[PDB]
């Protein structure tokens, strides 16, 4: 889908997203994995308040990691990850967040695949 297109567009000779690796993404992907587990536990059509706050914190973490790492900033701007966080936050639905997590999972999967 979109994830395959962006990973193919960002591939370079193998250099992905200006030198992005799984180790650089590991902190954020672990945070997003924590977010997912809380959503998996939740049984409510609407996102909780706590998950909304920590998704805002995930947005803050995206900004911080992008500021520290040029590769993560390139990944965020090319893959629209932060904007998608804002989109799911304003939509406030569990299924949309699960779709966004699926999108990130596809991103990392194809990144490893072309690695």
Partner 1 sequence: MYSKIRIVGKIDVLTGLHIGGGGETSMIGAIASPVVRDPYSRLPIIPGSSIKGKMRSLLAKHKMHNQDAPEILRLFGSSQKGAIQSSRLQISDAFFSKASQEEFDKKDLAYTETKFENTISRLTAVANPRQIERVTRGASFDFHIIYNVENINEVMADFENIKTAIHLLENDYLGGGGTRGNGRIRFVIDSIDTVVGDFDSSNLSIK
Taking CB within 5 to 8 Å according to partner kind, which of partner 1, its own copies, RNA, none is near residue 22? RNA
Residue 99 found at the interface with its own copies (CB under 8 A): yes
Site string for its own copies, 36-65 (x = CB under 8 A): -----------------x--xx--xx-xx-
CA–CA dist 72, 63 (Å, integer) = 9
Rounded Cα gap, residues 53 and 56, in angstroms: 5
* C-beta closer to RNA: residue 24 or 61: 24
Give the range of 19-27, 32-40, 72-80, 90-98 binding RNA by CB under 7 A: 19-27
Answer positive or negative: Cα dihedral of 74, 71, 111, 22: negative
Distance, in Å, from the CA atom of 108 to the CA atom of 106, rounded to the nearest integer, reads: 6
87 binds its own copies (CB under 8 A): no
Report how far Cα 63 is from the mean position of its chain's Cα atoms: 12
- Contact positions vs RNA (CB under 7 A): 21-24, 26, 68
């Amino acid at each position: 889908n979109f994830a395959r297109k962006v990973v193919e567009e960002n591939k370079r000779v193998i250099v992905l997203f200006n030198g992005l690796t799984t180790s650089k993404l590991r902190n954020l992907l672990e945070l997003i994995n924590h977010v997912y587990t809380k959503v998996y536990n939740s049984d409510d059509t609407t996102l909780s308040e706590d998950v909304r706050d920590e998704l805002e914190y995930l947005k803050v973490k995206f900004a911080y990691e992008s500021g520290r790492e040029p590769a993560v900033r390139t990944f965020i701007e090319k893959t629209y990850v932060d904007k998608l966080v804002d989109v799911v936050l304003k939509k406030n639905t569990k299924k949309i967040f699960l779709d966004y997590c699926k999108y990130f999972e596809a991103l990392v999967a194809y990144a490893k695949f072309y690695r």
